[PDB]
Design a protein around this ligand. Structure first.
Ligand SMILES: Cc1nnc2c(NC3CCN(CC(C)(C)F)CC3)cc(C(=O)N3[C@@H]4c5ccccc5C[C@H]3C(=O)N[C@@H]4C(C)C)nn12
Length: 130
């Protein structure tokens, strides 16, 4: 219905705003664009599902997220990919892992403070019915 399309549009507006706030944070610069194979040569082989904030914006605009839970699965993926590709004790690895964990905690903290639980429940019930 049109009222359901209004719901999903509001969801996309909310998701773009959260994504933009993550993208402008200087600590999350390395997550703003897809990992470049030429700059990080052993990446695209080890990481089967690459994910970054520009790809998240593209998925919002293609109507790929019908709930915040689906959006959070992709945020979790940016963090899990960084932990998998950088598991060493080296400070360079530890820095990316900390920035990844921080990116994930920030997205969860924004959503915990700003997302109305009934709005998410409405998104989930429309999704489940389709
Ligand atoms: C995401 C993601 N997950 N893991 C990593 C990572 N790992 C490095 C691999 C090398 N070791 C060296 C050590 C410690 C073993 F000596 C440190 C950890 C590096 C980058 C990263 O610094 N990028 C930079 C960047 C900048 C803007 C937007 C996106 C990106 C993405 C990525 C890239 O493809 N190019 C940039 C360039 C400076 C290499 N991102 N990244």
């Amino acid at each position: 219905s049109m009222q359901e399309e209004d719901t999903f549009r509001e969801l996309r507006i909310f998701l773009r705003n959260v994504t933009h706030r993550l993208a402008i944070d200087k600590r999350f610069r390395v997550f703003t664009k897809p990992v470049d194979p030429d700059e990080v040569p052993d990446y695209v082989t080890v990481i089967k599902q690459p994910m970054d904030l520009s790809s998240v914006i593209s998925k919002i605009d293609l109507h790929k997220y019908l709930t915040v839970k689906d959006y959070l699965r992709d945020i979790d993926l940016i963090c899990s990919n960084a932990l998998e590709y950088n598991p060493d004790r080296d400070p360079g690895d530890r820095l990316i892992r900390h920035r990844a964990c921080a990116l994930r905690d920030t997205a969860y903290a924004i959503i915990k403070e700003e997302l109305d639980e009934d709005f998410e429940q409405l998104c989930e019930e429309i999704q489940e019915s389709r």
